[PDB]
Amino acid sequence: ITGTSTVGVGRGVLGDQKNINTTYSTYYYLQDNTRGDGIFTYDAKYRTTLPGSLWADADNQFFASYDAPAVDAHYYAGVTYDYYKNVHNRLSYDGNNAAIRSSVHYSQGYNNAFWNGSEMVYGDGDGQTFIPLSGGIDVVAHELTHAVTDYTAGLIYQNESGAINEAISDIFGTLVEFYANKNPDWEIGEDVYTPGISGDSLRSMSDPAKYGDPDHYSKRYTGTQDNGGVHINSGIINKAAYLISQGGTHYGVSVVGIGRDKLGKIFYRALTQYLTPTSNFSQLRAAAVQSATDLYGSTSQEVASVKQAFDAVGVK
Ligand SMILES: [Ca+2]
Ligand SMILES: [Ca+2]
Ligand SMILES: [Ca+2]
Ligand SMILES: [Ca+2]
Ligand SMILES: [Zn+2]
């Protein structure tokens, strides 16, 4: 849209009030021209035809309940964009400021969100399992991080490479949540998942076995469902990332935590410099070990804790 940049206000999925960057041109559009080539939010109007229509609003105030998912998809996209820019110096997912597009109100009772190869897609949920998925900052950041993975390492979506793929997304989803300081934790999707049940979440990085996922490589799922257990075997890596950052003792292996900033740097470097499309866990450990070495030195505590956390989850 060709118009004037402006700022609007509205309410997100959880009822919180926020400003959003909009563009005026007869109507007020969810078009943020302050970040790269733009952040554009579309309304799928309960269908599956994508992208739907660029969101247009008459007075630049977004307080209706129908608007809530849009507000949040637009804002958290802006937050994820800024995380990657300011913390890793990466401009959009392609590293060239490609425009970021999202569609909300996709389909009816749709209990998921995904990156489809060109844009973000968010369901509204059924009201029991999910509320509108763009309400979870980590959900948003997890899915946009898949777009960064596609442009960089190219992890294919199955088996161990697909599990690494999902873990990277949970890792960077979590670190965006800490960066925004938006009630942070190590769990995935607790702000939108099962609104009638307090304290639960889809997955846990700090204790994956709490929701059924493996937390050691000997426990790994070796079946064929879920593309080879891409959302299940990610707990092995999540657990490891959690030990690197927070530290802990896990199957008798003690790890000294080095913090989230270092975890992010070590994993951003492995992702963009040593991982390939078909990398497996073992290769991820090597990549991670090499990245810490590159950044902090071969005999640093940083290397010591990468190795100890892969050893605690059984990845050699
Ligand atoms: Ca309005
Ligand atoms: Ca949280
Ligand atoms: Ca979370
Ligand atoms: Ca819940
Ligand atoms: Zn994912």
From Swiss-Prot:
GO terms for cellular component: extracellular region. It comes from the Bacteria. Thermostable. Ca(2+) 2 binds at D138, E177, D185, E187, E190. Keywords: Calcium, Hydrolase, Metal-binding, Metalloprotease, Protease, Secreted, Signal, Zinc, Zymogen. Zn(2+) binds at H142, H146, E166. Ca(2+) 3 binds at E177, N183, D185, E190. Binds 4 Ca(2+) ions per subunit. Binds 1 zinc ion per subunit. Ca(2+) 4 binds at Y193, T194, I197, D200. It is an enzyme of class 3 (hydrolase). Its cofactor is Ca(2+); Zn(2+). It is found in: Secreted. GO terms for molecular function: metal ion binding; metalloendopeptidase activity. Its EC number is 3.4.24.27. It catalyses: Preferential cleavage: Xaa-|-Leu > Xaa-|-Phe. Ca(2+) 1 binds at D57, D59, Q61. One of its GO terms (biological process) is proteolysis. Its main location: secreted. The active site is at E143, H231. Extracellular zinc metalloprotease. Belongs to the peptidase M4 family. This is Thermolysin. It comes from Bacillus thermoproteolyticus. The gene is npr. The chain holds residues 233 to 548 of 548 of the full protein.
